[PDB]
Amino acid sequence: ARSAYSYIRDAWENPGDGQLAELQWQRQQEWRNEGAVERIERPTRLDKARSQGYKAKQGVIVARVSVRKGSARKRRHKAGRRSKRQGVTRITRRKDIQRVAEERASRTFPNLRVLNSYSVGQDGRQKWHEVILIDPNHPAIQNDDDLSWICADDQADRVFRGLTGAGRRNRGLSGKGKGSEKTRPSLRSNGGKG
């Protein structure tokens, strides 16, 4: 039979209809008054969190992050530039907003490591994402067969090196065939042309 989780999932396919719509319209009022990174005791989208690796266990943390919507907040050139490089308004950053959120979260919890993240909506001027972080030093996690991998030294600051799920997609690594000529194994090894 359908799991209860499937119901949370189904509700979020359309965050603008049904009960969920009313919920968001209510919550966001509170969210807008919260800070940039708010640790929350329980995931707003349980199915999504569990699906991404979450576990109701010690050392597993969740935090909601809000980031402004839109293009790059860029300063206009202050020296000579050929027309092609004089733009300001239409320039957008190469990291998606969800990735910016993951980074702001990880900075707030220097000792933790980003496991994954997901969207929880947006209003006219900002977007919210909940990030799942893991304490690589807590024995409850060092002994977990499904999560202890994140304890290895080479997994340090993984979010800042694009090893996150949103990181790998944003780096054009989704495809294994056509189109990934300059993305795999890394953007840098391919001369930054991805």
Partner 1 sequence: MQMPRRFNTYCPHCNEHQEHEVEKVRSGRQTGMKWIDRQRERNSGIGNDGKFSKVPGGDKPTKKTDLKYRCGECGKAHLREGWRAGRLEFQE
SS3 122: strand
CA-nearest of 108, 129, 117, 122 to 166 is: 117
CB of 14 or CB of 189, closer to Mg ion: 189
Q: Does 82 bind partner 1 (CB under 8 A)?
A: yes
- Order of strands, sheet of 37-40, starting from the edge strand that comes earlier in the sequence: 37-40, 60-68, 126-134, 113-122
> In the stretch 152-171, what mask flags binding to Sr ion with x, by CB under 5 A?
-----x--------------
Pick the closest to residue 135 from 70, 57, 80, 193 (CA basis). Answer: 57
Q: Counting contacts by CB under 8 A, is residue 83 touching partner 1?
A: yes
Tokens of 36: 């940039």
Residue 39 contacts RNA per CB under 7 A? no
> In the stretch 78-117, what mask flags binding to K ion with x, by CB under 5 A?
----x-----------------------------------
Question: Binding partner of residue 166 among Cl ion, K ion, Mg ion, none, CB under 5 to 8 Å per kind?
Answer: none
List the single partner that 171 binds among K ion, Cl ion, Sr ion, none, CB under 5 to 8 Å by kind: none
DSSP string, 78-102: SS---GGG---TT---SS-HHHHHH
- Residue closer to partner 1, measured from CB, 21 or 91: 91
